[PDB]
Symmetry: D2
Subunit: 114 residues, 4 copies
Amino acid sequence: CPLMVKVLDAVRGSPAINVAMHVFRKAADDTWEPFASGKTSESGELHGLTTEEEFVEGIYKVEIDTKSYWKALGISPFHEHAEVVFTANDSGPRRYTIAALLSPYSYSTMAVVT
Amino acid sequence: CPLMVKVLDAVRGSPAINVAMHVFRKAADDTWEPFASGKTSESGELHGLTTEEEFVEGIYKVEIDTKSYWKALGISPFHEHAEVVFTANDSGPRRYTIAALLSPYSYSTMAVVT
Amino acid sequence: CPLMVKVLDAVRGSPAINVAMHVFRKAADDTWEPFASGKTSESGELHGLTTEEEFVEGIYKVEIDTKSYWKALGISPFHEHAEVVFTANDSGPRRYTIAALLSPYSYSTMAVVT
Amino acid sequence: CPLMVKVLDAVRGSPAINVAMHVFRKAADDTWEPFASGKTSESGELHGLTTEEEFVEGIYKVEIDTKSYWKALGISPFHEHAEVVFTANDSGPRRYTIAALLSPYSYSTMAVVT
């Protein structure tokens, strides 16, 4: 699994469940093309977005819909979404774990590359 | 000054100086329109981006060029840039401070609204 | 002002006001000695803790009472308090800003040394 | 496994390997008693610190020796260590994951409680 996302809720001390995820890849024309999407599981994780074969060199954007997550909890948050944009596999295939820690007015994102 | 930005370097324990920034407004069209830009000062800050008359309700994107900043220091960073996307509402508070804390493989961003 | 503290609330997007703080110095003995204390201001800040003459090289601990702060808001927090332990060296820079970003189940702390 | 620690390096985008960990429990006399210790694995994790039976109600402190970690990489960091102090199991047994994200002048800590 070359691309995995983990999302945590810092208000509740728990995984962030059912958070929607959309991944885009920058295309030849320099526009964002849809690449994969999904929802986090009860452990706050999303896997199975892609395969090594399809996950070629390129610039990827992971958009996490944090706004809907907080609104469903009764909270009106600051950000519309959290975005993570990065170049992948430009020196050969790698495995990427993207983690996000959410609070209503702040978020942190971390990448582990192996 | 309704919108201020502050950027800190968690590797050297200092303000992040000379970091380029671009601010966009979501165009009725849903296209991003250039709105303001600048480079952070010796104190890691950028203000005077807009005025209260021009800063109307809407969706705004703040794009911080973190990749050029790490490259200047000789460090290979993970992210292409850091983006902060938010709604400005006249309803709530009037002053927005966007802060960003940078590491090569992680960033944290926080909003103070007062 | 060689030592300043700043505390922010990531849940409400505001300074953390009236938060108690205690500063300790490691005693030749390795016992913590009271050194200074105060409550954060309406801007989430605490300064005037010490003077340059009294702030000599040593190991210092800053203890922030985050549990009382969340309890005041009606939120059950995870941590008993947040602690920041560091060496002050005259060698390097002279001014220390300790910042803390609080959530009920997470905190982040950063030092700017200038 | 009721108590697990995960440590990540935000400079290198990797688990933090071989980081020393000490856990203490506050004793009747209100002093810190040694409870368990260990080093993180190649995945940046530490498990097997304790059992449900031994992990009774109480106030625990997890001390992570971040200073030795950064010094071994050639970096002189700000903090002496990272400390996480919390009450555990006061409403029945729970499972605790303590995560820490490290940079030389900043760290973040998060708890997931299940």
